[PDB]
Amino acid sequence: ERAGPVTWVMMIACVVVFIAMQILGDQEVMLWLAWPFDPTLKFEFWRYFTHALMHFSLMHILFNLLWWWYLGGAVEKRLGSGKLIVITLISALLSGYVQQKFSGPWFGGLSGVVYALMGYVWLRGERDPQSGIYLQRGLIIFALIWIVAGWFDLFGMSMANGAHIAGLAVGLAMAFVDSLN
Ligand SMILES: CCCCCCCCCO[C@@H]1O[C@H](CO)[C@@H](O)[C@H](O)[C@H]1O
Ligand SMILES: CCCCCCCCCO[C@@H]1O[C@H](CO)[C@@H](O)[C@H](O)[C@H]1O
Protein backbone atom coordinates (compact mmCIF):
# COMPACT_ATOMS: atom_id res chain seq x y z
CA GLU A 1 0.00 0.00 0.00
CA ARG A 2 1.29 3.44 -0.99
CA ALA A 3 0.18 7.05 -0.53
CA GLY A 4 -2.73 8.04 -2.78
CA PRO A 5 -2.65 10.72 -5.49
CA VAL A 6 -3.57 13.74 -3.33
CA THR A 7 -1.26 12.73 -0.48
CA TRP A 8 1.60 12.18 -2.96
CA VAL A 9 1.14 15.27 -5.12
CA MET A 10 0.99 17.53 -2.05
CA MET A 11 4.28 16.08 -0.77
CA ILE A 12 5.94 16.47 -4.18
CA ALA A 13 4.73 20.04 -4.47
CA CYS A 14 6.02 21.03 -1.03
CA VAL A 15 9.43 19.53 -1.78
CA VAL A 16 9.65 21.30 -5.15
CA VAL A 17 8.68 24.64 -3.58
CA PHE A 18 11.15 24.09 -0.70
CA ILE A 19 13.91 23.49 -3.26
CA ALA A 20 12.91 26.64 -5.13
CA MET A 21 13.16 28.53 -1.85
CA GLN A 22 16.71 27.30 -1.18
CA ILE A 23 17.84 28.18 -4.71
CA LEU A 24 16.10 31.55 -5.11
CA GLY A 25 15.69 32.46 -1.44
CA ASP A 26 12.49 32.45 0.63
CA GLN A 27 11.55 36.05 -0.21
CA GLU A 28 11.66 35.52 -3.97
CA VAL A 29 9.26 32.59 -3.68
CA MET A 30 6.96 34.39 -1.21
CA LEU A 31 6.66 37.23 -3.69
CA TRP A 32 4.90 34.72 -5.99
CA LEU A 33 3.12 32.34 -3.59
CA ALA A 34 2.27 34.36 -0.45
CA TRP A 35 -1.23 35.43 0.63
CA PRO A 36 -1.99 38.72 -1.12
CA PHE A 37 0.25 41.33 0.51
CA ASP A 38 -0.78 44.32 -1.59
CA PRO A 39 -4.17 45.39 -2.96
CA THR A 40 -2.80 44.91 -6.48
CA LEU A 41 -2.60 41.17 -5.81
CA LYS A 42 -6.07 40.55 -4.35
CA PHE A 43 -7.36 38.86 -7.53
CA GLU A 44 -4.41 36.49 -7.88
CA PHE A 45 -6.55 33.71 -6.50
CA TRP A 46 -3.90 30.99 -6.23
CA ARG A 47 -2.46 33.02 -3.32
CA TYR A 48 -5.32 32.20 -0.97
CA PHE A 49 -4.04 28.61 -1.13
CA THR A 50 -0.40 28.50 -2.23
CA HIS A 51 0.93 29.85 1.07
CA ALA A 52 0.43 26.29 2.35
CA LEU A 53 3.17 25.03 0.00
CA MET A 54 6.01 27.08 1.54
CA HIS A 55 8.22 25.91 4.41
CA PHE A 56 10.97 27.82 6.19
CA SER A 57 13.23 25.19 7.75
CA LEU A 58 14.10 21.50 7.53
CA MET A 59 12.23 20.72 10.75
CA HIS A 60 9.16 22.64 9.52
CA ILE A 61 8.83 20.63 6.31
CA LEU A 62 9.94 17.31 7.85
CA PHE A 63 7.34 17.16 10.59
CA ASN A 64 4.54 18.70 8.52
CA LEU A 65 5.03 16.13 5.75
CA LEU A 66 5.35 13.21 8.20
CA TRP A 67 1.98 14.08 9.71
CA TRP A 68 0.49 14.79 6.28
CA TRP A 69 1.76 11.45 4.94
CA TYR A 70 0.37 9.53 7.90
CA LEU A 71 -2.96 11.32 8.53
CA GLY A 72 -3.68 12.52 5.01
CA GLY A 73 -2.65 9.12 3.67
CA ALA A 74 -5.10 7.38 6.03
CA VAL A 75 -7.99 9.72 5.18
CA GLU A 76 -7.35 9.34 1.45
CA LYS A 77 -7.09 5.55 1.62
CA ARG A 78 -10.11 4.91 3.83
CA LEU A 79 -12.38 7.85 2.98
CA GLY A 80 -11.30 8.97 -0.49
CA SER A 81 -9.32 11.64 -2.33
CA GLY A 82 -12.32 13.97 -2.29
CA LYS A 83 -12.45 14.01 1.50
CA LEU A 84 -8.78 14.93 1.76
CA ILE A 85 -9.12 17.65 -0.90
CA VAL A 86 -11.91 19.37 1.02
CA ILE A 87 -10.31 19.18 4.47
CA THR A 88 -7.15 20.62 2.89
CA LEU A 89 -8.79 23.50 1.00
CA ILE A 90 -11.02 24.62 3.87
CA SER A 91 -8.33 24.40 6.55
CA ALA A 92 -5.72 26.16 4.39
CA LEU A 93 -8.12 29.01 3.64
CA LEU A 94 -9.37 29.55 7.20
CA SER A 95 -6.04 29.12 8.96
CA GLY A 96 -4.40 31.37 6.38
CA TYR A 97 -7.14 33.95 6.83
CA VAL A 98 -6.76 34.05 10.60
CA GLN A 99 -2.97 34.11 10.34
CA GLN A 100 -2.94 37.15 8.05
CA LYS A 101 -5.59 38.94 10.13
CA PHE A 102 -3.48 38.88 13.30
CA SER A 103 0.09 38.69 11.97
CA GLY A 104 0.19 39.83 8.32
CA PRO A 105 0.61 37.96 5.01
CA TRP A 106 4.16 36.65 5.32
CA PHE A 107 3.73 33.05 6.43
CA GLY A 108 3.44 29.59 5.00
CA GLY A 109 3.27 25.84 5.34
CA LEU A 110 0.98 22.91 6.02
CA SER A 111 0.73 23.20 9.82
CA GLY A 112 -2.86 24.52 9.76
CA VAL A 113 -3.88 21.63 7.52
CA VAL A 114 -2.11 19.22 9.88
CA TYR A 115 -4.06 20.58 12.87
CA ALA A 116 -7.23 19.96 10.86
CA LEU A 117 -6.17 16.39 10.01
CA MET A 118 -5.26 15.68 13.65
CA GLY A 119 -8.64 16.91 14.85
CA TYR A 120 -10.48 15.06 12.10
CA VAL A 121 -8.76 11.71 12.53
CA TRP A 122 -8.88 11.82 16.32
CA LEU A 123 -12.53 12.86 16.60
CA ARG A 124 -13.71 10.51 13.87
CA GLY A 125 -12.09 7.62 15.74
CA GLU A 126 -13.48 8.67 19.11
CA ARG A 127 -17.06 9.09 17.88
CA ASP A 128 -17.17 6.57 15.05
CA PRO A 129 -14.72 3.65 15.53
CA GLN A 130 -16.46 1.61 12.81
CA SER A 131 -15.12 4.09 10.24
CA GLY A 132 -11.68 2.47 10.38
CA ILE A 133 -10.18 5.92 10.93
CA TYR A 134 -8.63 6.76 14.31
CA LEU A 135 -5.57 8.28 16.01
CA GLN A 136 -3.54 5.59 17.82
CA ARG A 137 -2.94 6.20 21.54
CA GLY A 138 0.80 6.46 21.08
CA LEU A 139 0.41 8.88 18.20
CA ILE A 140 -1.92 11.08 20.24
CA ILE A 141 1.04 11.62 22.55
CA PHE A 142 3.39 12.70 19.77
CA ALA A 143 0.73 14.80 18.12
CA LEU A 144 0.39 16.63 21.45
CA ILE A 145 4.15 17.11 21.67
CA TRP A 146 4.17 18.58 18.15
CA ILE A 147 1.26 20.85 19.10
CA VAL A 148 3.01 22.01 22.28
CA ALA A 149 6.21 22.66 20.35
CA GLY A 150 4.44 25.18 18.15
CA TRP A 151 2.16 26.54 20.84
CA PHE A 152 4.98 27.70 23.11
CA ASP A 153 7.39 28.78 20.38
CA LEU A 154 9.85 25.94 21.03
CA PHE A 155 9.68 25.10 17.35
CA GLY A 156 9.02 27.70 14.65
CA MET A 157 6.08 26.79 12.39
CA SER A 158 5.48 30.17 10.77
CA MET A 159 1.82 30.21 11.94
CA ALA A 160 0.35 31.57 15.20
CA ASN A 161 -1.82 29.77 17.79
CA GLY A 162 -5.13 31.31 16.69
CA ALA A 163 -4.52 30.22 13.10
CA HIS A 164 -3.81 26.69 14.27
CA ILE A 165 -7.00 26.66 16.33
CA ALA A 166 -8.89 27.68 13.19
CA GLY A 167 -7.41 24.71 11.33
CA LEU A 168 -8.24 22.38 14.21
CA ALA A 169 -11.83 23.65 14.25
CA VAL A 170 -12.29 22.76 10.57
CA GLY A 171 -11.12 19.19 11.15
CA LEU A 172 -13.26 18.77 14.27
CA ALA A 173 -16.33 20.17 12.52
CA MET A 174 -15.99 17.88 9.50
CA ALA A 175 -15.43 14.84 11.76
CA PHE A 176 -18.53 15.84 13.71
CA VAL A 177 -20.61 16.07 10.55
CA ASP A 178 -19.25 12.77 9.25
CA SER A 179 -19.99 10.97 12.52
CA LEU A 180 -23.63 12.06 12.44
CA ASN A 181 -24.18 10.93 8.86
C1 LIG B 1 5.91 11.87 14.48
C2 LIG B 1 5.58 11.93 13.01
C3 LIG B 1 4.20 11.35 12.75
C4 LIG B 1 4.25 9.83 12.64
C5 LIG B 1 4.72 9.42 11.25
C6 LIG B 1 4.25 8.02 10.89
C7 LIG B 1 4.30 7.83 9.37
C8 LIG B 1 3.72 6.50 8.94
C9 LIG B 1 3.54 6.43 7.42
O1 LIG B 1 3.19 5.10 7.06
C10 LIG B 1 2.82 4.97 5.69
O2 LIG B 1 1.56 5.60 5.48
C11 LIG B 1 1.20 5.58 4.11
C12 LIG B 1 -0.01 6.47 3.86
O3 LIG B 1 -1.12 5.98 4.62
C13 LIG B 1 0.91 4.13 3.72
O4 LIG B 1 0.52 4.06 2.35
C14 LIG B 1 2.18 3.31 3.92
O5 LIG B 1 1.88 1.93 3.67
C15 LIG B 1 2.72 3.49 5.33
O6 LIG B 1 4.01 2.88 5.43
C1 LIG C 1 10.44 11.69 15.36
C2 LIG C 1 9.72 10.64 14.54
C3 LIG C 1 9.26 9.49 15.42
C4 LIG C 1 8.56 8.40 14.62
C5 LIG C 1 8.97 7.03 15.13
C6 LIG C 1 8.15 5.91 14.50
C7 LIG C 1 6.72 5.92 15.03
C8 LIG C 1 6.05 4.58 14.76
C9 LIG C 1 4.76 4.78 13.99
O1 LIG C 1 4.55 3.64 13.16
C10 LIG C 1 3.42 3.79 12.31
O2 LIG C 1 2.23 3.53 13.05
C11 LIG C 1 1.03 3.66 12.27
C12 LIG C 1 -0.17 3.39 13.16
O3 LIG C 1 -0.21 1.99 13.48
C13 LIG C 1 1.05 2.68 11.09
O4 LIG C 1 -0.07 2.92 10.24
C14 LIG C 1 2.32 2.85 10.27
O5 LIG C 1 2.40 1.82 9.28
C15 LIG C 1 3.54 2.77 11.18
O6 LIG C 1 4.72 3.05 10.41
mmCIF file of N, CA, C and O in Angstrom, residues 63 67 115 118 135 137-155 157:
data_model
loop_
_atom_site.group_PDB
_atom_site.id
_atom_site.type_symbol
_atom_site.label_atom_id
_atom_site.label_comp_id
_atom_site.label_asym_id
_atom_site.label_seq_id
_atom_site.Cartn_x
_atom_site.Cartn_y
_atom_site.Cartn_z
ATOM 1 N N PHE A 63 8.428 17.582 9.734
ATOM 2 C CA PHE A 63 7.340 17.156 10.594
ATOM 3 C C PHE A 63 5.967 17.405 9.963
ATOM 4 O O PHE A 63 5.056 16.599 10.132
ATOM 5 N N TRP A 67 3.371 14.126 9.262
ATOM 6 C CA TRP A 67 1.981 14.082 9.712
ATOM 7 C C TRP A 67 1.016 14.021 8.534
ATOM 8 O O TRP A 67 0.011 13.308 8.586
ATOM 9 N N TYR A 115 -3.158 20.463 11.726
ATOM 10 C CA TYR A 115 -4.065 20.576 12.873
ATOM 11 C C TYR A 115 -5.464 20.078 12.494
ATOM 12 O O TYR A 115 -6.124 19.373 13.261
ATOM 13 N N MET A 118 -5.318 16.240 12.294
ATOM 14 C CA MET A 118 -5.263 15.680 13.649
ATOM 15 C C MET A 118 -6.638 15.677 14.316
ATOM 16 O O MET A 118 -7.078 14.661 14.867
ATOM 17 N N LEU A 135 -6.929 7.901 15.629
ATOM 18 C CA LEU A 135 -5.572 8.284 16.009
ATOM 19 C C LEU A 135 -5.093 7.387 17.156
ATOM 20 O O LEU A 135 -5.584 7.485 18.275
ATOM 21 N N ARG A 137 -3.329 5.643 20.242
ATOM 22 C CA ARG A 137 -2.939 6.196 21.537
ATOM 23 C C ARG A 137 -1.550 6.804 21.517
ATOM 24 O O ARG A 137 -1.353 7.961 21.905
ATOM 25 N N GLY A 138 -0.576 6.010 21.093
ATOM 26 C CA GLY A 138 0.799 6.464 21.077
ATOM 27 C C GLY A 138 0.943 7.713 20.231
ATOM 28 O O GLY A 138 1.657 8.645 20.589
ATOM 29 N N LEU A 139 0.260 7.742 19.093
ATOM 30 C CA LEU A 139 0.414 8.883 18.200
ATOM 31 C C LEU A 139 -0.287 10.120 18.736
ATOM 32 O O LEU A 139 0.093 11.236 18.395
ATOM 33 N N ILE A 140 -1.295 9.937 19.583
ATOM 34 C CA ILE A 140 -1.918 11.081 20.245
ATOM 35 C C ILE A 140 -0.852 11.805 21.051
ATOM 36 O O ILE A 140 -0.788 13.035 21.069
ATOM 37 N N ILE A 141 -0.004 11.033 21.724
ATOM 38 C CA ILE A 141 1.037 11.620 22.553
ATOM 39 C C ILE A 141 1.983 12.485 21.719
ATOM 40 O O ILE A 141 2.322 13.601 22.105
ATOM 41 N N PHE A 142 2.409 11.971 20.572
ATOM 42 C CA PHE A 142 3.392 12.695 19.773
ATOM 43 C C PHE A 142 2.758 13.833 18.990
ATOM 44 O O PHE A 142 3.413 14.830 18.715
ATOM 45 N N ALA A 143 1.478 13.686 18.675
ATOM 46 C CA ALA A 143 0.726 14.802 18.115
ATOM 47 C C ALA A 143 0.691 15.937 19.136
ATOM 48 O O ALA A 143 0.891 17.095 18.788
ATOM 49 N N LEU A 144 0.450 15.607 20.406
ATOM 50 C CA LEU A 144 0.388 16.635 21.448
ATOM 51 C C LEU A 144 1.729 17.315 21.653
ATOM 52 O O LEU A 144 1.786 18.515 21.911
ATOM 53 N N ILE A 145 2.808 16.546 21.547
ATOM 54 C CA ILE A 145 4.146 17.110 21.673
ATOM 55 C C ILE A 145 4.429 18.081 20.521
ATOM 56 O O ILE A 145 5.000 19.149 20.733
ATOM 57 N N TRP A 146 4.023 17.704 19.313
ATOM 58 C CA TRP A 146 4.166 18.581 18.147
ATOM 59 C C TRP A 146 3.332 19.852 18.333
ATOM 60 O O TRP A 146 3.772 20.955 17.998
ATOM 61 N N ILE A 147 2.121 19.704 18.858
ATOM 62 C CA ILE A 147 1.263 20.853 19.103
ATOM 63 C C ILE A 147 1.899 21.792 20.129
ATOM 64 O O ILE A 147 2.014 23.000 19.908
ATOM 65 N N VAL A 148 2.335 21.226 21.249
ATOM 66 C CA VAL A 148 3.006 22.010 22.284
ATOM 67 C C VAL A 148 4.231 22.749 21.769
ATOM 68 O O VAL A 148 4.480 23.899 22.147
ATOM 69 N N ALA A 149 5.001 22.083 20.914
ATOM 70 C CA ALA A 149 6.214 22.662 20.351
ATOM 71 C C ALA A 149 5.903 23.988 19.656
ATOM 72 O O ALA A 149 6.611 24.985 19.827
ATOM 73 N N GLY A 150 4.829 23.990 18.880
ATOM 74 C CA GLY A 150 4.438 25.181 18.152
ATOM 75 C C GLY A 150 3.794 26.185 19.077
ATOM 76 O O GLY A 150 4.050 27.388 18.986
ATOM 77 N N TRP A 151 2.964 25.682 19.985
ATOM 78 C CA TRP A 151 2.157 26.536 20.836
ATOM 79 C C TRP A 151 3.019 27.461 21.687
ATOM 80 O O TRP A 151 2.705 28.644 21.847
ATOM 81 N N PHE A 152 4.116 26.926 22.219
ATOM 82 C CA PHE A 152 4.979 27.699 23.111
ATOM 83 C C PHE A 152 6.265 28.180 22.446
ATOM 84 O O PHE A 152 7.238 28.502 23.120
ATOM 85 N N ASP A 153 6.270 28.213 21.118
ATOM 86 C CA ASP A 153 7.391 28.780 20.376
ATOM 87 C C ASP A 153 8.716 28.048 20.591
ATOM 88 O O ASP A 153 9.784 28.652 20.530
ATOM 89 N N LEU A 154 8.648 26.745 20.841
ATOM 90 C CA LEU A 154 9.852 25.944 21.029
ATOM 91 C C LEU A 154 10.365 25.500 19.672
ATOM 92 O O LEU A 154 11.496 25.054 19.530
ATOM 93 N N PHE A 155 9.493 25.638 18.680
ATOM 94 C CA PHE A 155 9.684 25.097 17.347
ATOM 95 C C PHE A 155 8.925 26.066 16.451
ATOM 96 O O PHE A 155 7.722 26.260 16.633
ATOM 97 N N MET A 157 6.960 27.357 13.414
ATOM 98 C CA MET A 157 6.080 26.786 12.392
ATOM 99 C C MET A 157 5.507 27.840 11.457
ATOM 100 O O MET A 157 4.578 27.551 10.695
#
